[PDB]
Design an enzyme around this catalytic site. Structure first.
Site, PDB file in Angstrom:
ATOM      1  N   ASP B   7       0.967  -1.065   0.001  1.00 25.22           N
ATOM      2  CA  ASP B   7      -0.080   0.076   0.080  1.00 25.22           C
ATOM      3  C   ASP B   7       0.994   1.351  -0.159  1.00 25.22           C
ATOM      4  O   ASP B   7       2.066   1.265   0.409  1.00 25.22           O
ATOM      5  CB  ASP B   7      -1.110   0.077   1.113  1.00 25.22           C
ATOM      6  CG  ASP B   7      -1.899   1.442   0.997  1.00 25.22           C
ATOM      7  OD1 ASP B   7      -2.486   1.495   0.114  1.00 25.22           O
ATOM      8  OD2 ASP B   7      -1.947   1.910   2.351  1.00 25.22           O
ATOM      9  N   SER B   8       0.314   2.271  -0.494  1.00 28.37           N
ATOM     10  CA  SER B   8       0.932   3.677  -0.252  1.00 28.37           C
ATOM     11  C   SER B   8       1.446   4.019   1.188  1.00 28.37           C
ATOM     12  O   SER B   8       2.172   4.794   1.460  1.00 28.37           O
ATOM     13  CB  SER B   8       0.307   4.847  -0.876  1.00 28.37           C
ATOM     14  OG  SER B   8      -1.085   5.009  -0.189  1.00 28.37           O
ATOM     15  N   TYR B  39      -0.595   8.708  -2.956  1.00 31.42           N
ATOM     16  CA  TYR B  39      -0.353   8.508  -4.305  1.00 31.42           C
ATOM     17  C   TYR B  39      -1.477   9.039  -5.106  1.00 31.42           C
ATOM     18  O   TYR B  39      -1.355   9.495  -6.462  1.00 31.42           O
ATOM     19  CB  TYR B  39      -0.317   6.874  -4.759  1.00 31.42           C
ATOM     20  CG  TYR B  39       0.949   6.208  -4.331  1.00 31.42           C
ATOM     21  CD1 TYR B  39       2.029   6.698  -3.503  1.00 31.42           C
ATOM     22  CD2 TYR B  39       0.830   4.787  -4.597  1.00 31.42           C
ATOM     23  CE1 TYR B  39       3.003   5.884  -3.152  1.00 31.42           C
ATOM     24  CE2 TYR B  39       2.057   3.968  -4.259  1.00 31.42           C
ATOM     25  CZ  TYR B  39       3.153   4.434  -3.620  1.00 31.42           C
ATOM     26  OH  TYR B  39       3.907   3.663  -3.231  1.00 31.42           O
ATOM     27  N   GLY B  40      -2.983   9.130  -4.612  1.00 35.25           N
ATOM     28  CA  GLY B  40      -3.897   9.749  -5.351  1.00 35.25           C
ATOM     29  C   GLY B  40      -3.856  10.741  -5.869  1.00 35.25           C
ATOM     30  O   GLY B  40      -4.659  11.070  -6.894  1.00 35.25           O
ATOM     31  N   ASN B  71      -5.734   1.014  -3.846  1.00 30.87           N
ATOM     32  CA  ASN B  71      -6.651   1.089  -5.073  1.00 30.87           C
ATOM     33  C   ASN B  71      -5.985   2.128  -6.114  1.00 30.87           C
ATOM     34  O   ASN B  71      -6.246   1.868  -7.581  1.00 30.87           O
ATOM     35  CB  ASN B  71      -8.122   1.914  -4.780  1.00 30.87           C
ATOM     36  CG  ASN B  71      -8.743   0.978  -3.817  1.00 30.87           C
ATOM     37  OD1 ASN B  71      -8.495   1.038  -2.779  1.00 30.87           O
ATOM     38  ND2 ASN B  71      -9.923   0.280  -4.091  1.00 30.87           N
ATOM     39  N   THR B  72      -5.376   2.973  -5.747  1.00 30.51           N
ATOM     40  CA  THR B  72      -4.690   3.855  -6.753  1.00 30.51           C
ATOM     41  C   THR B  72      -3.557   3.146  -7.513  1.00 30.51           C
ATOM     42  O   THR B  72      -3.236   3.242  -8.782  1.00 30.51           O
ATOM     43  CB  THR B  72      -3.917   5.236  -6.133  1.00 30.51           C
ATOM     44  OG1 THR B  72      -4.971   6.108  -5.690  1.00 30.51           O
ATOM     45  CG2 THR B  72      -3.364   5.937  -6.948  1.00 30.51           C
ATOM     46  N   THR B 182      -8.506   2.603  -0.358  1.00 29.83           N
ATOM     47  CA  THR B 182      -8.395   1.955   0.876  1.00 29.83           C
ATOM     48  C   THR B 182      -8.907   2.451   2.243  1.00 29.83           C
ATOM     49  O   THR B 182      -9.109   1.934   3.448  1.00 29.83           O
ATOM     50  CB  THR B 182      -6.564   1.805   1.295  1.00 29.83           C
ATOM     51  OG1 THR B 182      -6.043   3.216   1.171  1.00 29.83           O
ATOM     52  CG2 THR B 182      -6.095   1.014   0.456  1.00 29.83           C
ATOM     53  N   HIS B 183      -9.152   3.849   2.204  1.00 29.87           N
ATOM     54  CA  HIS B 183      -9.254   4.735   3.683  1.00 29.87           C
ATOM     55  C   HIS B 183     -10.928   4.669   3.655  1.00 29.87           C
ATOM     56  O   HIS B 183     -11.194   4.903   5.057  1.00 29.87           O
ATOM     57  CB  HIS B 183      -8.870   5.824   3.605  1.00 29.87           C
ATOM     58  CG  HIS B 183      -7.459   6.207   3.511  1.00 29.87           C
ATOM     59  ND1 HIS B 183      -6.413   5.691   2.724  1.00 29.87           N
ATOM     60  CD2 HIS B 183      -6.551   7.031   4.211  1.00 29.87           C
ATOM     61  CE1 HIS B 183      -5.426   5.984   2.948  1.00 29.87           C
ATOM     62  NE2 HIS B 183      -5.405   7.042   3.877  1.00 29.87           N
TER      63      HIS B 183
HETATM   64  N1  DGL Z   1      -4.237   4.039  -0.713  1.00 34.14           N
HETATM   65  C1  DGL Z   1      -4.738   4.970  -1.490  1.00 34.14           C
HETATM   66  C2  DGL Z   1      -5.225   6.202  -0.679  1.00 34.14           C
HETATM   67  C3  DGL Z   1      -4.025   7.045  -0.059  1.00 34.14           C
HETATM   68  C4  DGL Z   1      -3.217   7.459  -1.427  1.00 34.14           C
HETATM   69  O1  DGL Z   1      -3.609   8.529  -2.089  1.00 34.14           O
HETATM   70  O2  DGL Z   1      -1.936   7.134  -1.460  1.00 34.14           O
HETATM   71  C5  DGL Z   1      -5.841   4.283  -2.360  1.00 34.14           C
HETATM   72  O3  DGL Z   1      -6.551   3.426  -2.025  1.00 34.14           O
HETATM   73  O4  DGL Z   1      -6.463   5.028  -3.300  1.00 34.14           O
END
Ligand code: DGL
Ligand code: DGL
Lengths: 254, 254
Positions: B7-8, B39-40, B71-72, B182-183
């Site tokens: 994950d990020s 990352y988003g 997800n990103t 994810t959040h």
């Molecule tokens: N983990 C990212 C959320 C946080 C990010 O933008 O890195 C997602 O699921 O999109």
């Protein structure tokens, strides 16, 4: 001099704006670490390493002075960067302390420092103000102002609710508010309007702008005339997409 | 069987929570790129390179399957990651399509996709949905949910104002809301509550949780015995301060 300006991303454009309006330098190389921004939510070890890598970016560009426009990098990494550099590195914290000495003679005036979590937990501003004898200093980490501002939430109920969220617990009504973050000049009037409305004041607290304070420091330290450089060479560099960063520069700088 | 979860940052704990609840894996190596999150808000070239670099992190760990919980990264980097990988890589987009295929037989049902700006811009969900015949699809980047959730703002007026900001223009009542980030599980009930209030419903839209979808997907693909591993080995790694990331795990996994 050929100058570098380092920031974590696009926020440093509030410092570049002050620099450009002063017309003091003829060549400026801006580098924003937009692949890794924000810094303010991350830990001292990570930020110090980011500051050192910013030096590596600038080393081949033969700059004569590096401005760290980022209040977070200024607060956590500046001293380590300085030890590793043969050129002067000027951050945005000390210039604001100098500005306060010059504009706030009452050592008991309530000052409110605003910044990122990392900036506020470093106590960089608290220590420096105390060293200069200021006695009535509060600090406040207004972390969510950064993402709101980058999403262009500069007005409206969302911004007001976010200001309420952070300011309502305040005990002391500040007479001085330090914008200890690159982003916060973009809501400076809103912050002024907050304290005038919710406290029925006639005049807002004095706001300290990091870019304006560093321009003044640089003019004094290096004897730099204003309005000397009307068509500077400005270059933009980024760790993420530079086209994305230049599009933001157009918005922040105009 | 030994798996990796990438994950990020800490958002991926929503997926890890789902994985642990199913008690199907014995060894999980979690890696959050907490030095560079989020990352988003960043660009496809950057995110793709972040994804390839995650593959390098897992090489000494000898994993047999990598879950991309983000997800990103799933939306932007998965294909390149898979091309460069000798082990199967599973993202969180396709398992959620499968959950919809299985639970939403009316191909005309209105679906609302929520995610980061990069995820929504990629159209990965819309394209996957089209591939199964779901054409009544809307999407909404709800960028500010990520920093609000990381600041633990899971209730109260600030979150409600933020939801109003993103949701107030919605005219089509969705029958399905994909939590394509994810959040977003941490505010799922609040999102349900909002739609019930805004559209005056007695029952909320169906919410698709990315972590639950991928668990189901993995159970079907590898015929894993749920409730087999009651005391898994879980390792946390981060690009930022791993103590900070583990502390968050405690909160998210509770
Ligand atoms: N983990 C990212 C959320 C946080 C990010 O933008 O890195 C997602 O699921 O999109
Ligand atoms: N440039 C940062 C704000 C954005 C960040 O957190 O990196 C500062 O001045 O504190």
């Amino acid at each position: 001099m050929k100058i570098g300006v380092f920031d974590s991303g696009v926020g440093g454009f509030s410092v570049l704006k002050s620099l450009l309006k002063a017309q003091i330098f003829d060549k400026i190389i801006y580098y924003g670490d937009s692949a890794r921004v924000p810094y303010g939510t991350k830990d001292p070890t990570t930020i110090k390493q980011f500051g050192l890598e910013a030096l590596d970016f600038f080393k081949p560009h033969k700059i004569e002075l590096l401005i760290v426009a980022c209040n977070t990098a200024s607060a956590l990494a500046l001293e380590e960067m300085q030890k590793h550099s043969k050129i002067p590195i000027v951050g945005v914290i000390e210039p604001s302390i100098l500005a306060i000495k010059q504009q706030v003679k009452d050592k008991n005036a309530p000052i409110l420092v605003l910044g990122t979590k990392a900036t506020i937990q470093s106590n960089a501003y608290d220590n420096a103000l105390k060293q200069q004898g200021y006695l009535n200093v509060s600090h406040l980490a207004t972390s969510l102002f950064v993402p709101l501002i980058e999403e262009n939430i500069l007005e409206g109920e969302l911004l007001e609710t976010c200001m309420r969220y952070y300011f309502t617990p305040l005990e002391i009504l500040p007479e001085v508010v330090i914008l200890g973050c690159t982003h916060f000049p973009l809501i400076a009037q809103k912050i002024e309007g907050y304290f005038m409305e919710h406290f029925a004041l006639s005049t807002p607290p004095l706001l300290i702008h990091s870019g304006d304070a560093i321009v003044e420091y640089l003019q004094q330290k290096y004897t730099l005339k204003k309005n000397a450089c009307t068509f500077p060479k400005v270059e933009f560099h980024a760790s993420g997409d530079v086209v994305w960063l230049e599009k933001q520069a157009k918005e922040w700088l105009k």
